[PDB]
Amino acid sequence: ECSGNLFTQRTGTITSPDYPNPYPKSSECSYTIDLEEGFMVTLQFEDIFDIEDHPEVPCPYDYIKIKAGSKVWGPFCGEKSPEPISTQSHSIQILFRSDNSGENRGWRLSYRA
Q: Which residues are annotated as a binding site for Ca(2+)?
A: 52, 62, 99, 101
Under the criterion CB under 5 A, does residue 78 sit at the interface with Ca ion?
no
Query: With binding defined as CB under 5 A, does residue 28 bind Ca ion?
Result: no
**What's the half-sphere exposure (Cβ side, CA atoms, 13 Å) at 10?**
6
> Applying CB under 5 A, does 99 fall inside the site for Ca ion?
yes
| Minimum separation from the CB atom of position 5 to Ca ion (A) | 21
Please pick, from the candidates 62, 85, 89, 113, the single residue that binds Ca ion as defined by CB under 5 A: 62
Write down the least CB distance from residue 92 to Ca ion, Å: 24
For the bound state, the minimum distance from the C-beta of residue 65 to Ca ion, rounded and expressed in Å, comes to: 15
**Which residue of 50, 52, 64, 108 would you call a contact of Ca ion, by CB under 5 A?**
52
Residue 17 backbone zone (phi > 0: left; psi -120 to 50: alpha; other: beta): beta
Q: Please work out the total of residues on this chain that contact Ca ion, with binding judged by CB under 5 A.
A: 6
Note whether 53 binds Ca ion by CB under 5 A: no
Question: Residue 6 half-sphere exposure, CB side, CA atoms within 13 Å?
Answer: 3
Burial of 37 (0-12, 13-18, 19+ CB in 10 A): exposed
Three-state DSSP class for 91? strand
Name the amino acid, one letter, at 56: E
Interface residue list for Ca ion (CB under 5 A): 52, 61-62, 98-99, 102
